[model samples]
Every structure is written in structure tokens, then in C-alpha cells.
Target: FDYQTVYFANQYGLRTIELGESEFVDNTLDNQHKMVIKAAWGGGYTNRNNVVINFKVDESLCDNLYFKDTDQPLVPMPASYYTLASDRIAIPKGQIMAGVEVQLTDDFFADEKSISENYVIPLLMTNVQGADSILQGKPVVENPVLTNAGDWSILPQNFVLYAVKYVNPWHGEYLRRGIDHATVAGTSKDIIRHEQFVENDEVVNISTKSMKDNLLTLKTKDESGKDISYTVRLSFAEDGSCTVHSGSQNVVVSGSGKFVSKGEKNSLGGKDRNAIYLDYTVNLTDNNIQLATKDTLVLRTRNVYGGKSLEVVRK
Candidate 1:
């Protein structure tokens, strides 16, 4: 099980995928000193700007201070002075300028409704010693996509380029399918179709699913057997991984990670009936923050058969 494109972010024409991405912090309204931890397991990205900075990308930021959310916001990061996260971004070691900028994702930062007030962008200036230079950032600019054609390398941080992977259940990685163009395609959280396939032995060739295929089932039953469904859109990725797109919500479900789906409520009641709720858990159990700051990463999974959606806890 190699790594996959768990998350990604960009500023301009060049969109980085499956690799590592970047982001930053605020000063007053929010806390700064904490390092920015990018998750590799279940992070996501949408709108070409939802960056996922993995903690495993950088070890310096992966210290004891990398997981405050794991324990308590008051738990404090390993830096003690800073927060508990793999990469609190260190604040440049003793330099408190006007503000410390966290470049997680312009896509994420720009989203006012999706993200919390503290999780917003252009982290303001705050009080702290050292880390003098007030580091600011331009949107994760793209390297410029060529018009005609060009060679690009967005291979996931640890994924095997073009390897075939299986799906798991514990981690919510169940959907292992593809969608082709030449049909209707949009983001949604509705239930993906389970009875739409003809998987017989005669298999001349299995029909491929289009991005138009269902993901979040509207007829899904809740734990209590209630008809439950979500608005999740499945963004087919070049790699085995995928991005769950429901409105402005972006989440990457890795093809390599563990995933599970139960019950039998597969079918989007409407066109884009949402497959997942907002409280989905995408725990990236790695510690490398530096690499995520430079490249892009995308995770994969879908058909989340009523997979419960969890809230995003930014580091």
C-alpha cells in the first residue's frame, strides 16, 4: 500500500496533484506559532485550491507539537511555546512580524462558509517573539499549463504512479471504480449506484462509469434505518485516488488507505443526492509536513454507502 494523492493546492495555471501542497496561519483572531500539518491519509482538495499540507512531508514540524487536535487544544504542541503539530510552521524561529501567513489552499482560504473563522486565510499578525519577517504568500500559483501539450509530474507523494490498488473498509475506502467523459458530470454526495453494473463471467468488457455516476445515495438508511443521503461529488483522479466534491466541500479518499462501507442503500435519489455528510473522518496517520509544502497529494475513495461525514479539524 503506497501513498496516494491525499490532497492538493495551487495558485495559478499549474495544478499540483497527488504530491504535497501548502498553506499558512493568522495572528490575532487565530493562533500562529503552530505548524501547518498536512495529512496524507484522508485529506482532500476541490476547486483547484483546496490544499492539503501533509505532516509527514516535513519532520521538523512533526514533533510532539503536531497533534493538538488529537488530545486537547490546550494540550500544547511539542514546541510547547508553539502548538502540538508536525509543522506549526515554526514562525521562522523567533520572528514575530505583522502576521504569519498559512498557505493551506486559496481554494480553502477563499471558502468563507466551509471553513471556520479561525481556519480562514491570510492569518493576521499576532504577538510573539522572534520570527521577524512577516511572511506573506501569493496563491499557490500554478506553473502554467501549456496550451498544446506538455509533460507534468504530479505523482502522489508515495503512490506507485499507475499501480492498481484494492479498497478497505475500516478507513472508509470502498469505492473502486472509474468514470469517463462524454456524459453528464458534476459534484455530489449522493449514494453511488450498486445495482447498475452487469458483472457477469461473460465479461466482454465491463461498462465504465462516468463522472455522472452516483456517489452519495439518497436512499441510504441511517444507523436507525432512516433514509439518509448526502451531497457528495466524486472527482475522478488520474491516480487511483479520488476527491469527494459536494458543493464547496473537498475531501480526498486514498486508494491505498483502509476503507469500509456497510448496509445496502446505494442510489442517489436525485441527480446529485450527496453520498456523504459533513462529518466524515479523514485521519492521515503520518508525520511529514515539509514535503506537503512543496508538492501536491491526492487521496482516493467513494460510493461511501452512507459513510458518515465528519468535521474537518485543521492543525
Candidate 2:
């Protein structure tokens, strides 16, 4: 009698699957998303027989767990959101491993209503062939005897809780291109400065600081090589209306814009939609004191899809 147990290789914690940017935009299925099914025997013995493990999407488990890093409850992902390559995985003879591929459906990416929410797919192992037992629930440690100091226990992780999230479309590298009009110090004349950030421009980097919020940080250096940082907050509505504000006290940003669908063609020659156009004002401040202000600043952003180029067009 073989006392072998079949379970998920990484069954202890929440497993996250990040949908790549290209996959989000192109909507293609690939092996980049998958999970492995493994089997093990006690006493350092390898199972010599073949084992077939059957699994299914068990939504009930959704109530058993919470979203990773948050106290929020996990929402069960709809069955239509993904497709399993197979319901059964086989650990071949003399081998201890097999795998199950998860292919997210295109509809999942297009689901704007639920895209921003955290979801989970609870894959519960239902049966196992050629294995004496299946690991289910949490593992518990036990002391068989008071004198047995080195005694341990094995528990089966019957389910794999896969937390699914998509990379925010607004999260990526961007080029800042635009012009700034500033008055010459102690002079009445205003100067128009061309703002075009080219490739390998090491002076600036725009990064998204939050996955759930539209928080962006702009880091750059002044002519004196001193670091300058600004936090920008963006809010969007279903009607395409957008509002921009400055999250940092050093800068005051106020603007209103709309979500425009326009961009270069992707790898499939499809139009890269999703862009923003905003007309805003920027005021540089120091300790609540105004330094200078740029009014009616026109800014346009296009999807570069893995490219860097912030183009600032003059109005």
C-alpha cells in the first residue's frame, strides 16, 4: 500500500497571475499562465505508478479566502472568464509532476465592469487515481508522542486559490512632451519652451505608484541635478470625462479632459485605442508660496505599447 498524497506544488499562499500588457491589448492565449500539479509519497519514497488528478473550479472556496494583501473578500471569477486546457492532469510513471494550463478568455479583458475588482479562481482537486490519499485543507502539525520531538505531520492542500488581476492600462512607461510658458524672472516677457522627451532621456521617469488607484509619480531632475518629484492623480468616469489634480504640495495641477480612443496600430495591425487629452494649468509652489504659473497647458497622451515618447503639443 502506497501512502502517497497529491497536491498543488505551491498551495500554501495566494498565487497571482498578472496579465501582461501585450496580452491585455492583443487578447491572445498562451502558456504564460499555468499551474503545476504535483504528487509526493511519505518516507522519501517516489511513486512508481502513474497518478491522475481531477480538478474543477470550485466557487464555494471563494468564501473561504480573502484577497491577498487586503481584508476584502475574494470574488469568484466567472467560469466564462477562463478556460482550462484539461480537467485532469496525469503524473506519468516514475515522475511526480503534471500541469494544467489556464487560458483567460478575451471577454475577461473586455469586462470593464469587473476589471478593477479583485477576483479568484478556486481550483479544487476532486479525485486522485493510483494515490493513496489527497491533501485537503490546511496542513496541521502534530506530536504523536511527548517523547517524539522530531515528529511532524503532512496535510493536503486540496485547492489552489489563484488571484487574478490585470495590469492597469494606464500603468506603463510614458514620454512627457509639451511646452511650458513661463515669465522671465523680474521681466514682463514670457518665454515658450519646447517640451519633447526623446529616447534615452534619463532626466525623467513616470511611474504608477498604486495598482488600485490612478496615482502617478513623476521623478525628474532640475538643471542643478537636484531631484524633483511630483504626484499626479487622475480620475475617470464612464462618460469619458476625466479630472486631473496634483497630489504633491509642491505643484498645483487642475485640468479636465476626456478619454479619447486613438493610438498606433498594434502587432496585429489593430488600432491601439485609449488616449487622453487634457488642458490644464500648472503652478510651481514653495511652502505654500507661489513661484510661477503656466496656464492653459495642452497635453495629449497616446498609447505607445512598450515604447517611450511623451509628446507635448503646443496650443
Which is the leading candidate under TM-score?
2
TM-score of 2: 0.51
lDDT against the true structure, per candidate, is: 0.22, 0.51
List model 2 lDDT by residue over 1-315, tens digit each.
546877765542333333324323333332254433333433227877788888887777655445434556667778888778788878777777677777777666556533333566667888988787667533245433211223324444566656554544354444333434432222333333334323322222223433333555654334344656777676666665667788787888777665444432331124353344455554555422222322221112312232111111111
| Native-to-model Cα distance after best TM-score fit, residue 102 in candidate 1, in Å | 11
The sequence of per-residue lDDT tens digits that candidate 1 reaches over residues 1-315 is 321223212111111111111122122212211223222222222212222222222222112221122331211112111222332223222222111232333232232321111121111112212212221222233652221112233322221010001111112222222221111122223333323432211111111123221243212233343543233334343433344433212322222211112222432332211122222322112211010101111112222221111222224
Give residue 150's lDDT in candidate 1 (0 to 100). Answer: 25
Q: In model 2, which regions exceed 4 Å deviation?
A: 12-44, 112-117, 137-154, 168-179, 182-315
Per-structure clash totals for the candidates: 115, 8
Q: Give stretches of model 1 more than 4 Å off.
A: 1-122, 126-132, 135-215, 218-315
TM-scores, all candidates, are: 0.18, 0.51
* Cα RMSD of predicted structure 2: 11.3
lDDT agreement of model 1 with the native: 0.22
